Enzyme design. Structure first.
Site, PDB file in Angstrom:
ATOM      1  N   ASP A  10       5.017 -27.403  33.474  1.00  0.00           N
ATOM      2  CA  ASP A  10       4.326 -26.237  33.013  1.00  0.00           C
ATOM      3  C   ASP A  10       5.070 -25.899  31.727  1.00  0.00           C
ATOM      4  OD1 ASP A  10       2.495 -23.105  34.461  1.00  0.00           O
ATOM      5  OD2 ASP A  10       3.050 -23.848  32.170  1.00  0.00           O
ATOM      6  N   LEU A  11       4.549 -26.370  30.497  1.00  0.00           N
ATOM      7  CA  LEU A  11       5.701 -26.290  29.397  1.00  0.00           C
ATOM      8  C   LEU A  11       5.545 -24.499  29.117  1.00  0.00           C
ATOM      9  CD1 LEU A  11       6.343 -28.675  29.625  1.00  0.00           C
ATOM     10  CD2 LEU A  11       5.329 -29.357  27.430  1.00  0.00           C
ATOM     11  N   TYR A  15       1.911 -23.664  22.396  1.00  0.00           N
ATOM     12  CA  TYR A  15       1.450 -23.543  20.949  1.00  0.00           C
ATOM     13  C   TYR A  15       2.735 -22.967  20.266  1.00  0.00           C
ATOM     14  CZ  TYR A  15      -3.483 -23.955  22.000  1.00  0.00           C
ATOM     15  OH  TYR A  15      -4.786 -24.173  22.700  1.00  0.00           O
ATOM     16  N   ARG A  47       7.669 -11.608  23.973  1.00  0.00           N
ATOM     17  CA  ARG A  47       7.396 -10.947  25.298  1.00  0.00           C
ATOM     18  C   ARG A  47       8.175 -10.134  25.797  1.00  0.00           C
ATOM     19  NH1 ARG A  47       4.991 -16.392  28.653  1.00  0.00           N
ATOM     20  NH2 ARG A  47       3.926 -17.497  27.151  1.00  0.00           N
ATOM     21  N   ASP A 102      -1.125 -27.670  28.383  1.00  0.00           N
ATOM     22  CA  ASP A 102       0.224 -27.585  28.673  1.00  0.00           C
ATOM     23  C   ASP A 102       0.602 -27.724  30.068  1.00  0.00           C
ATOM     24  OD1 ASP A 102      -0.061 -24.109  28.277  1.00  0.00           O
ATOM     25  OD2 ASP A 102      -0.445 -25.090  29.946  1.00  0.00           O
ATOM     26  N   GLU A 103      -0.195 -28.387  31.212  1.00  0.00           N
ATOM     27  CA  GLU A 103       0.375 -28.598  32.312  1.00  0.00           C
ATOM     28  C   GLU A 103      -0.028 -29.925  32.612  1.00  0.00           C
ATOM     29  OE1 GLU A 103      -1.275 -25.385  35.137  1.00  0.00           O
ATOM     30  OE2 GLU A 103      -0.930 -23.808  33.748  1.00  0.00           O
TER      31      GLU A 103
END
Ligand SMILES: Cc1cn([C@H]2C[C@H](O)[C@@H](COP(=O)(O)OP(=O)(O)OP(=O)(O)O)O2)c(=O)[nH]c1=O
Ligand SMILES: [Mg+2]
Ligand SMILES: [Mg+2]
Ligand code: NA
Length: 385
Positions: A10-11, A15, A47, A102-103
């Site tokens: 899971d990157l 993006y 975040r 992305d997974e």
DNA sequence: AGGACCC
DNA sequence: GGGGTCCT
């Protein structure tokens, strides 16, 4: 004999990683990737300032005034990186299932077994975990399931090292006995970490969720159904009547989601391979009425023809998708599709024939007089042969 | 052709 | 948003 070793990869902030690599001036800077009025994703430095995934752009600036924004509407580069990730994983083991860009899931069972067969048994006592063990659980090196999951964690570490070393990308991984639990546990330590779930901690993981919508496979509709039946926690769902559940949700949904609530998921990792469809979209507030549509549909087609042409396979079905408004109402889009004519499957010359097809599918849906207001145009090529 | 799900 | 998947 039945027990698998699955990894979910899971990157991180995908993006944003791609944009940060494109422009390292942004590496140390708080960054959001914008699509229309949405900050679809942001790097971990945004975040920490309370920038959230899928926060609108005014809210985002209002939260972090210095936040830098980069346009992410064109997905070409993210899509190219995404396939470089999946192909790298496929070199480890070929059964790789993509989930979004992305997974990926990989079934490591055969690979684990081959590595164990290579060990001499005075090296079996030497097996160690790579990364975190969920819930800090004690490892039992005499438990063949624990040994297999630890060798899984070592392969996962190798995949993560190879994705950083070969592609410049960081991400998390979860190793568990099925895809549900691997996906759940990969997110326990983030960013750029990995976690392994041993079987005795499965109930602790599933009960760590705070509501049934957090279970992958239970979406907006289904959760809303469950909520209406008084089902809110994972344990609510585990203990709810099978029979009432079957009547409400049909046997298929009911039996599958109640098994999920226990941590049980027998679905196989499916080899994704090349994509089954290619599409492009553009969104607007009423910036299409009318025959501002043909132009938009031309631009979408232009780009899509390049992708199909570079892909090599040829599509036998084309589809046009629209969306209408207002005012505040329902989600549903509308579409029309038809086969592409045989001579036309041979990639003005391609454009005029395809645009004309598209404009006819357009008319079938929109009454070009006594008209309706559009908020989306999308073209999709599929039925690839 | 539309619905559920996923990112 | 701007993509994707499979099922009914
Ligand atoms: C869920 C979701 C993701 N995306 C895009 C933006 C992300 O870079 C890619 C996000 O998939 P995710 O893996 O959900 O998010 P991520 O890689 O952005 O963030 P995190 O580190 O927590 O894993 O999908 C959308 O465009 N719309 C969506 O609804
Ligand atoms: Mg993810
Ligand atoms: Mg991710
Ligand atoms: Na869910």
């Amino acid at each position: 004999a039945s027990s698998r070793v699955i990894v979910h990869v899971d990157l991180d902030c995908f993006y944003a990683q791609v944009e940060m690599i494109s422009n390292p001036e942004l590496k140390d800077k708080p960054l959001g990737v914008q699509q229309k009025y949405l900050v679809v994703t942001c790097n971990y430095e945004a975040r920490k300032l309370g920038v959230k995934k899928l926060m609108n752009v005014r809210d985002a600036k209002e939260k972090c005034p210095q936040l830098v924004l980069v346009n992410g509407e064109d997905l070409t580069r993210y899509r190219e990186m995404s396939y470089k990730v999946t192909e790298l994983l496929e070199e480890f083991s070929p059964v790789v299932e993509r989930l979004g860009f992305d997974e990926n899931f990989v079934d490591l069972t055969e690979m684990v077994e081959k590595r164990l067969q290579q060990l001499q048994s005075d090296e079996l006592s030497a097996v160690t975990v790579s990364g975190h063990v969920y819930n800090n659980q004690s490892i039992n090196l005499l438990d063949v399931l624990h040994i297999r999951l630890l060798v899984g964690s070592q392969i996962a570490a190798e995949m993560r090292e190879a994705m950083y070393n070969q592609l410049g990308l960081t991400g998390c991984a979860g190793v568990a006995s099925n895809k549900l639990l691997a996906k759940l546990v990969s997110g326990v330590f983030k960013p750029n970490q990995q976690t392994v779930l041993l079987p005795e901690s499965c109930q602790h993981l599933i009960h760590s969720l705070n509501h049934i919508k957090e279970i992958p496979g239970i979406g907006y509709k289904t959760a809303k159904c469950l909520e209406a039946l008084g089902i809110n926690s994972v344990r609510d769902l585990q203990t709810f009547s099978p029979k009432i559940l079957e009547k409400e949700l049909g046997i298929s949904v009911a039996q599958r989601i109640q098994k999920l609530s226990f941590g049980e998921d027998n679905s196989p990792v499916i080899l994704s391979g090349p994509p089954q469809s290619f599409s492009e979209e553009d969104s607007f507030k009423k910036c299409s009425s009318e025959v501002e549509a043909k132009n938009k549909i031309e631009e979408l087609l232009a780009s899509l023809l390049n992708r199909v042409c570079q892909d090599g396979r040829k599509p036998h079905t084309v589809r046009l998708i629209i969306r209408r408004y207002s005012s505040e109402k329902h989600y549903g889009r509308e579409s029309r599709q038809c086969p592409i004519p045989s001579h036309v499957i041979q990639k003005y010359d391609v454009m005029t024939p395809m645009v004309d097809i598209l404009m006819k599918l357009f008319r079938n849906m929109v009454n070009v007089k006594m008209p309706f207001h559009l908020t989306l145009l999308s073209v999709c090529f599929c039925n690839l042969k």
